[PDB]
Design a protein around this ligand. Structure first.
Ligand SMILES: CC(C)(COP(=O)(O)OP(=O)(O)OC[C@H]1O[C@@H](n2cnc3c(N)ncnc32)[C@H](O)[C@@H]1O)[C@@H](O)C(=O)NCCC(=O)NCCS
Ligand SMILES: CC(C)(COP(=O)(O)OP(=O)(O)OC[C@H]1O[C@@H](n2cnc3c(N)ncnc32)[C@H](O)[C@@H]1O)[C@@H](O)C(=O)NCCC(=O)NCCS
Ligand SMILES: [Cl-]
Ligand SMILES: [Cl-]
Ligand SMILES: [Mg+2]
Ligand SMILES: [Mg+2]
Lengths: 163, 163
């Protein structure tokens, strides 16, 4: 029996309670979990790579089997570099499901060793996404219930700097 | 690090190439896989429990980490009896996805330890289901491409007995 290593890729812009839930659930089922934060070199995140990693390590660092790594390029190249057992994704909605099904098959064609496993969210997180959180915060709403406290504060320090 | 045990529940009536693919993929990612064949005490399968188990062991017995077990009752009770890490399901279509999402949440309410992981099929199996296979065989079509050879023969021995 070998050691299992799953990658959880994402922009994590920012990390939410939903992502925390998934990573905790995955950490119980596999030997190593890598939170893989897509840099977004052409794709414009609100929070920088450094902010995103730090926000993630603050919510999940207490789990000893979870690593945190920024990446760019083709997910299958990252998959091979990392020697991963699988990629993990969460599935919140039908459109997620259909995109994810297509990506899994495309990746399996690029690399026959590729594998994708999916979790569905607990219902209390099923309505939460990074995009929507950004939108409420930007309009000065309160996102405390949907994100860790460190993310709450990070939104204030964006309001207060201008970047 | 503990030993992982996932249950793959199903009627497996009969097992298809799609199910074989999923179980092989799961066997690489977890320490033990249990093919859990729902007896169907009120729910009328074409093939008996004994036929279904045998057909499954014939396709998958070569994998040393796969067990085969009939069960009835509440899947969460089976989950606890088996001391499982998770239940595994395949997701072929949108309607699958929505039923599975609801069942995972219902089960998580019955037992907070419950967990469900999902795989999507390779595209060459994405159109295959037990129900459709039964239907083609019943109308004397050829199911050789969609099922292991032992299942082909089992359909002949049903044509030739009458049960
Ligand atoms: C798809 C990319 C951008 C990352 O995904 P995304 O931008 O959607 O990230 P985000 O952090 O918002 O979501 C992360 C994942 O967790 C899931 N998730 C998020 N929030 C929740 C929640 N509350 N509950 C459950 N699941 C959730 C998402 O559905 C997603 O699978 C990334 O994988 C990537 O760029 N990959 C490399 C590029 C590539 O190779 N692309 C094409 C060829 S493959
Ligand atoms: C849902 C039951 C009947 C089994 O599922 P089902 O009858 O759909 O079995 P079947 O063998 O056809 O499918 C098995 C699984 O593999 C998947 N699958 C089948 N063929 C393929 C394929 N070609 N590719 C990918 N996935 C596939 C299915 O989508 C399904 O998840 C069973 O779980 C059950 O009865 N559980 C206990 C009852 C219970 O507790 N029910 C309600 C309270 S939870
Ligand atoms: Cl996003
Ligand atoms: Cl069926
Ligand atoms: Mg998201
Ligand atoms: Mg089926």
């Amino acid at each position: 029996m070998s050691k299992t290593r799953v990658i959880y890729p994402g922009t994590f812009d920012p990390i939410t309670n939903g992502h925390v839930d998934l990573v905790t659930r995955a950490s119980r089922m596999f030997d190593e979990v890598v939170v893989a934060i897509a840099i977004g070199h052409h794709k414009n995140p609100l929070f920088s790579l450094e902010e995103r990693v730090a926000l993630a390590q603050s919510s999940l660092g207490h789990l000893s089997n979870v690593e945190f790594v920024g990446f760019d390029g083709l997910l299958v190249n990252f998959f091979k570099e990392q020697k991963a057992t699988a990629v993990l994704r969460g599935l919140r909605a039908v459109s997620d499901f259909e995109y994810e099904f297509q990506l899994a098959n495309m990746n399996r064609q690029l690399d026959p060793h590729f594998e994708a496993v999916f979790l569905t969210p607990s219902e209390q997180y099923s309505f939460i996404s990074s995009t929507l959180i950004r939108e409420i915060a930007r309009l000065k709403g309160d996102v405390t219930k949907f994100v860790p406290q460190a993310v709450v504060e990070a939104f204030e320090r964006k309001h207060q700097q201008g970047w």
